[PDB]
Design a protein around this ligand. Structure first.
Ligand SMILES: Nc1nc(=O)c2ncn([C@@H]3O[C@@H]4COP(=O)(O)O[C@H]5[C@@H](O)[C@H](n6cc(-c7ccc(COc8cccc9ccccc89)cc7)c7c(N)ncnc76)O[C@@H]5COP(=O)(O)O[C@@H]3[C@@H]4O)c2[nH]1
Lengths: 172, 189
């Protein structure tokens, strides 16, 4: 129906359905077991997670995954392991990243030729989350990942604490 | 009304292909190609062409192995890679593949070649009932994707005679993909 639908399907088709089946095996080769995907509704997606929260610190790369796709021999799929600090001490570790298509929504709202307002961006970000959630709820490849959608100026927000709440909630 | 949705889907995917890929690799492509030719490929009739050739089959049929789509396309090598930190993934890799194009047993061309990856999403959405698009929708979205991508690249600062779209219809296997590419390649020289 709209922009977000194609973006959510492309994220499943071109990425999640390919890496999620192999993820637990890659974590074993390394050794939480799931891919945590951050879904900021404002589409603010820093390339460096420590820029969002200094208590989120890069630890290691997972063993990389490569495939032939669309005529590119061995295109690389990599994921990053992060530690989450509480009072300067590690409180948890997980494979963590932002949903990259939220950057397409953000940049589209910034390019005049895309004809795409800020209101469009927020509405399409929500539709992106809803579509992706609806796809993953029925997808055979997915308890392999956890989506965290949130609406961020707000000194009361700690992204590291929020991920930690999910990690702790998951354990039980 | 349903066409407005075909437009919006194709519109968003072409922008994602520009925003998340082409605007990031096109500025440095010709440096990577020049470097490769100067240091690794001193073949006076085998220079890698200076443009990214992007295949747009209008039925969105995209195989993952390009060389197996035509006896006369052979994988040769990869360009030097590009990595970057992307959305919290440290050192996400961008790589591109070089092919030789064969004709009458001879080498007729050498180029960086790949399919436009979002066409696979167009195909899948016509295949999955949750996405709810028909084959006729897919064909329309593919045309709109191509036209949007051409419009974007025509205005894009990162595209300066370094990218060429190859759009074609392809059913029977009379069709030669190498011949399709070689026609555009020869038109450049
Ligand atoms: N030819 C080409 N080479 C690239 O390196 C490249 N990077 C982006 N794009 C396209 O540009 C637009 C915006 O990209 P965006 O980052 O905004 O959204 C991405 C993103 O969230 C996520 N996702 C995608 C990649 C990725 C990695 C490699 C390739 C090229 O070979 C392939 C090899 C093996 C299997 C393949 C199976 C299917 C297709 C290709 C395959 C292509 C994609 C990836 C990764 N390595 N790590 C983390 N997440 C990743 O899935 C979203 C939609 O992916 P999609 O496949 O549809 O294509 C993209 C999108 O249509 C590229 N196209």
């Amino acid at each position: 129906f709209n922009v977000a639908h194609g973006l959510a399907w492309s994220y499943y088709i071109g990425y999640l359905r390919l890496i999620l089946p192999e993820l637990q095996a890659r974590i074993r080769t390394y050794n939480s077991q799931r891919l945590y995907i951050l879904l900021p509704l404002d589409c603010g997606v820093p390339d460096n997670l420590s820029m969002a929260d200094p208590n989120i610190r890069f630890l290691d790369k997972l063993p990389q995954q490569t495939g032939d796709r669309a005529g590119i021999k061995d295109r690389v799929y990599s994921n990053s392991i992060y530690e989450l600090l509480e009072n300067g001490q590690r409180a948890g570790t997980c494979v963590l990243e932002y949903a990259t298509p939220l950057q397409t929504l953000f940049a589209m709202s910034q390019y005049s030729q895309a004809g795409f307002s800020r209101e469009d961006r927020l509405e399409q970000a929500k539709l992106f989350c809803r579509t992706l959630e609806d796809i993953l709820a029925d997808a055979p490849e997915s308890n392999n990942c956890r989506l965290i959608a949130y609406q961020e100026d707000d000194s009361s927000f700690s992204l590291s604490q929020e991920v930690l709440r999910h990690l702790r909630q998951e354990e039980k």
